[PDB]
Amino acid sequence: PLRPVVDASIQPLLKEHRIPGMAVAVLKDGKAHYFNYGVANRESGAGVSEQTLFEIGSVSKTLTATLGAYAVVKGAMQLDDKASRHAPWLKGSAFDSITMGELATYSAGGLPLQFPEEVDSSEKMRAYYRQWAPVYSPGSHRQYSNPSIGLFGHLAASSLKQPFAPLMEQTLLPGLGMHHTYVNVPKQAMASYAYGYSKEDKPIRVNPGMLADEAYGIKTSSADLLRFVKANIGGVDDKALQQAISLTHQGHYSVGGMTQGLGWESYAYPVTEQTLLAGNSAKVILEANPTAAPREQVLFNKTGSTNGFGAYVAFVPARGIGIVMLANRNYPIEARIKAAHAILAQLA
Prior knowledge:
- The two termini are 14 Å apart.
- The strands form four sheets. This protein has a nine-stranded antiparallel sheet, with helices on both faces. Strands 4-8 form a two-stranded antiparallel sheet. Strands 5-12 form a two-stranded antiparallel ribbon.
- The chain is of the alpha+beta class and 348 residues long.
- Helix content is 35%, strand content 19%.
């Protein structure tokens, strides 16, 4: 029933962009549907299943946002806390006037997309934030930023008195029932871990980097990620976890037809292809944009990429539908959006 609809949208993608493998998962009123294409590891010849591990890149930020929200629900921090409240080493810097919420939503004042290359230790990372000169006043501009949401997740874990990676892998992820989701992939699961493929068609995986865990470091399966979507639609039995998830759906400000929340970015549904494309465009991703008041049915999404992988997630809680698409090539974001939007509209 669903198979031909998904195939019609996914098969041309695989062909045109030479995608080795893709795991697609669709949620429709409680029911999970898995659609698996191609090959996870060209060298070993292992095929893709809904249990294959993919790098999801910035889709990680939705989980980091959920951990931050969990810290809020637990009373360990608040979004309007100054960042330096949670880090003694930041006292006396610009971060005495920048909030946790602003870090989470990339609106702290122009932190850049990536850390400079020389920031490759915690000592240099601390120095980087202390040296950083604010470009914009807090809250006035959105500049998509790994140092920004990265510091948010780091300080949130700090407020809960646990290191980020174990807090994620031992409290949040199993709390969401995601037992094949990792910051660090253990030996027993390495067979399940795909390789990504570059423009050169070489097998690659994500390189460690400062705050990688917090900003882009999650490995997961289409099945585990669809579970996360299901938690975001028909919530969880743990009420603290439920509250934290709900926090991530609140709109903080808008840019065009896109509304920024914690991790998730949202749109009025139904949504035109144009509006989704614009909200997920290079202008929105790579440039600073002024913030506007948040949008007053809702679609949530998040894109994610590493050098070798390309991910997308979108769901509409009011219609009980969602889609997860995980590929081991970083193929164009607009192709992900066009396919997902086509599929969801036929589900609705």
